[model samples]
Target chain A: KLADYRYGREEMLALFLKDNKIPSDLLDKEFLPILQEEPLPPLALVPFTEEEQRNFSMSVNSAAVLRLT
Target chain B: PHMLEAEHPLQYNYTFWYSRRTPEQNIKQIGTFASVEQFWRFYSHMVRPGDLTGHSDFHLFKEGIKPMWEDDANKNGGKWIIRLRKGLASRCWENLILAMLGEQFMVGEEICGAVVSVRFQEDIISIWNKTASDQATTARIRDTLRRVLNLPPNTIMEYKTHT
Candidate 1:
């Protein structure tokens, strides 16, 4: 029931079409993987990038301005 | 004087966890509470997700369920993800959590937890459930989220499995 959106692309297409009520005759057009998972794995327990750290410090500094006001 | 009365008990005890932006990115357990009053005390004092600075996340999960993929309750589960604009995180997050706390999803114990990831340009929110194979349950959760958040007609929701 749980099919990987990539490895099971064909299966997913079938499921998507069946579930979403899309007709197969629209083959003249193309489709993409909206249901596909990102190439990144798990998407859990990710670390922040350096820019994010900078943004974090900036946010903290900005909040400090409120104390002075 | 009404505030001095007994606090209303929640349907389930929940734990609050916050993760910092670090190599370790440790998921620290802030606290656990079972009552409405207790939840507010922690929530009101916290920085809203929109106000939170880069790369951070707040997870509110059922007491025993860790907000990680490896948690027993999440191993085979998946989540319904909503990508939102920067300014909407705070209100949307509050609404999402309240809906969960109030048992608005109607999916029984399928709900494991919810999280708000505060990022630079946009914020992401997700609600995790126990069974990736249960399409009925997953679909219901998606619909409930749309209604709870009052999302626009074109809003996109994605469901990704833990594996």
Candidate 2:
């Protein structure tokens, strides 16, 4: 069982590396580094029903617009 | 008297756009941000480019510019594309956008926008500009991209024209 402990630690370390792989100098100061424990939310595709997709297509170049006020 | 500024402004206002191509391709204007703090709020809630699945894309373009070839600003322009392997998207995308926002390209009014596309096999990142025929402007963009992305000397960058 002693050797089994290494697996979790390794996985966590890998995750840590993945999170901070980008060097700081490469990024601008405005953008903060992503932390392993507190990950950003998943960037998900806006779910559109089949009918909605077809309707959107009929409108030509359809753009889902949003204004941050 | 005010001691310090509350919010800092960016050089240019940028609009974050997203697209998905499953059966019918579609584009969405996520939000527009004129300040550093505003951009972070959107970025913090979104998924990194590397983690996004399917035929999806993230685009950051200057305000008033669309991320389409037919866009007025992009019609006569071109882009330099860098095909990145799967694991490199997040870091490379971040660096590229940062460089664009920080005006590192040094080509005045030339840069249009930047796009990151995630696919099944690989990820592609491209920086769009206002002119394709201008050798000098295109060259400067290439050099800046190399430094910003920390690309290797031998990395192949493909330049394509919209026209």
Candidate 3:
């Protein structure tokens, strides 16, 4: 359910794993395969940093950008 | 001059809400719609999440369910939140909304709602579920998120209770 992901973690771990902090202990056997080599999510797979965010972020100051009804 | 096709109905009716950080009390429901066509009609006209000014939020929830923690349906629930890169908010939010409306969560009635908050530094998207302690259900939901969004590896998602 959508609600399940909203409040899935308690602290640390960051919201939605958007930061790409993957934990092997958290993966489900049914949903995620625990490959011996890759170990599911492979730890280093989601390697984005704060520096990258600064580059990827977009500014919302333009009134002309809003396509409202 | 155009013929409208039959509308696909969802399992539950959904409401669209938006919030603006203004003294005018900006958080309010825009409408409740059931069919897929209506959702698209309503969604297409919405300003992309990234286009929203700071302190603005857009939420979609099941009908009768308010997007607040104090609501009866959400009082005991929790949320899984993921920050979005600025450019990613619009598409990510769109994907999340589609997944929610499509009943792709498939977690029975445990779903509550979703919210996308636009901020100056980053935009956030959270999905609310009824049971916070249901490990199996929540994990599946997380997997579904990755699957639907095609999230890149190393995505950091944090789960928090509605307290």
Candidate 4:
């Protein structure tokens, strides 16, 4: 019979770290401090240009056609 | 303004005003099996998958669960991420909803809802859970997902907690 495998959040985290070649122990000492120091990702700033907006609208229209046919 | 009150018929016409209803009312009544059948009849006749605008999504969740991480039921739960190829999304979504409503999976009750997000990069179909920490429930939910989606045993479905 195939074994019933189950993993917790921590176990998953450890597996990810192992897969990425990162030390699992770094979760306690290094990860939090590094995250605190890094700036958050930027949010959208500018509005879409007219050409960009038109192209986007066209895409949706094309998508609608594709969905139907 | 009328100078004198005019007598009118007491009967009120309940003309079928489809879009006039709120999302809550629409979801409440129209989300069930019977209503959804009717909705799909009209939807399939009028709308096509490719015709949808960017950022436009079609969502149907349980009665009160909002399609957001901040929803009370969704606060503790995370999503079972299903990454689908562009052309495969529609079929996957159809199978997902049918399996969910049919209760084919064991933990179907724990299913908070499902969503199909269309984007330029990758279209995503996610089954939202009610609790991220509930390992037993999450596991059952994942098992059901894999079974219903006809995924191979080697494919891994990752669970991510709400940020």
Best by lDDT: 1
Identify the runs in model 1 with alpha carbons over 4 angstroms from their true place. A1-69, B1-5
Q: In candidate 3, what are the lDDT values of residues B1-163, reduced to their tens digit? A: 1213554465677887777775432567666766665554555445567767658888899989999877888877788877765666666676677777667777888888889888777778889998788887789788988776666655667788855
Of candidate 2 chain A, the 10-residue stretch with the lowest lDDT total is A60-69
- C-alpha lDDT of residue A19 in model 1: 24
Best candidate, TM-score-wise?
A: 2
Report the lDDT of model 3 for residue A66.
28
Candidates' lDDT values, in order? 0.64, 0.63, 0.62, 0.45
* Worst 10-residue lDDT window, candidate 2 chain B: B1-10
* Candidates by lDDT, descending order: 1, 2, 3, 4
Write one digit per residue (lDDT tens) for candidate 1, span B54-149: 588889999999998878889889999777656566666777877786676778789899999887676788999999999999989988887777
TM-score of each: 0.68, 0.69, 0.67, 0.51
Candidate that beats the other on DockQ, 1 or 2, i.e. the better one: 2
lDDT of 1: 0.64
Candidate 3, residues A1-69, lDDT tens digits: the string is 243322211211121122223223223242121112221221123454675454334332223222221
Q: State which docking tier applies to candidate 2.
A: incorrect
- Expressed as tens digits, the lDDT of each residue in B6-58 for candidate 4 is 22111111010111122221311122212222222222222223234354344
Instruction: Give the CA lDDT, 0 to 100, for residue B97 in model 2.
Output: 73
Q: What does candidate 3 score in Cα RMSD to the true structure?
A: 16.5
**Each prediction's DockQ against the real complex:** 0.02, 0.03, 0.03, 0.01
As for DockQ, the candidate ahead, 2 or 4, is: 2
